[PDB]
């Protein structure tokens, strides 16, 4: 049994809800919240920017030190950093950004990072300002992630379309 509430059921392991991931993280304090990161861990806009704002920029400070030591992530890669006031840990995952011309086949590699964690609160990778089709992102999620994932979808209209169209 876990703390996640109101999540709609998709498969054995994937659950979905219309929610603000910041507000959901603040309520649940999950072991892992996933950030929709870029390779530079520059959290200016999108989920990364909303999560970072909710940490009062502490996520960005920690991320800048990580990059100064380790260099950029790979597209499709991830790192585990603090969850600050939102979660125990934040898994920063880099999905391909279609608005930068990145290979969408890297989306499966991105979701494979989730399998290293038994339970996660996450957004749909490569959706929103990353430019991918969220229906496609949900399909790759369900077909890739084997661990228990609780997906938060910010837009109510999109949530309803994702549920209604789910095979
Ligand atoms: N959960 C959010 C928030 C914001 N912008 C977003 N863009 C995608 N998701 N997302 C600002 C308020 C919270």
UniProtKB/Swiss-Prot annotation:
Residues 1-167 form the Macro domain. It is a multi-pass membrane protein. It is found in: Host endoplasmic reticulum membrane. Changing residue 31 to A: In strain: Mu/B.1.621. Coiled coil: none annotated. Inhibited in vitro by GRL-0617. It catalyses: Thiol-dependent hydrolysis of ester, thioester, amide, peptide and isopeptide bonds formed by the C-terminal Gly of ubiquitin (a 76-residue protein attached to proteins as an intracellular targeting signal). Responsible for the cleavages located at the N-terminus of the replicase polyprotein. Participates together with nsp4 in the assembly of virally-induced cytoplasmic double-membrane vesicles necessary for viral replication. Antagonizes innate immune induction of type I interferon by blocking the phosphorylation, dimerization and subsequent nuclear translocation of host IRF3. Also prevents host NF-kappa-B signaling. In addition, PL-PRO possesses a deubiquitinating/deISGylating activity and processes both 'Lys-48'- and 'Lys-63'-linked polyubiquitin chains from cellular substrates. May form homohexamers. Interacts with N protein. This is Papain-like protease nsp3. It comes from Severe acute respiratory syndrome coronavirus 2 (2019-nCoV). The chain holds residues 1025 to 1191 of 7096 of the full protein.
């Amino acid at each position: 049994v876990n703390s996640f509430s109101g999540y709609l059921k998709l498969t054995d392991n994937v659950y979905i809800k219309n929610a603000d991931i910041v507000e959901e993280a603040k309520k649940v304090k999950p072991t892992v919240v996933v950030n929709a990161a870029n390779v530079y861990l520059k959290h200016g806009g999108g989920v990364a920017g909303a999560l970072n704002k909710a940490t009062n920029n502490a996520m960005q400070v920690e991320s800048d030190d990580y990059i100064a030591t380790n260099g950029p992530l790979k597209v499709g890669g991830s790192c585990v950093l603090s969850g600050h006031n939102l979660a125990k840990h934040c898994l920063h995952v880099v999905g391909p950004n279609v608005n930068k011309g990145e290979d969408i086949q890297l989306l499966k590699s991105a979701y494979e990072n989730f399998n290293q964690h038994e339970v996660l609160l996450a957004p749909l990778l490569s959706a929103g300002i990353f430019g991918a089709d969220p229906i496609h992102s949900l399909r790759v999620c369900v077909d890739t992630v084997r661990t228990n994932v609780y997906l938060a979808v910010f837009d109510k209209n999109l949530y309803d379309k994702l549920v209604s169209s789910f095979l």
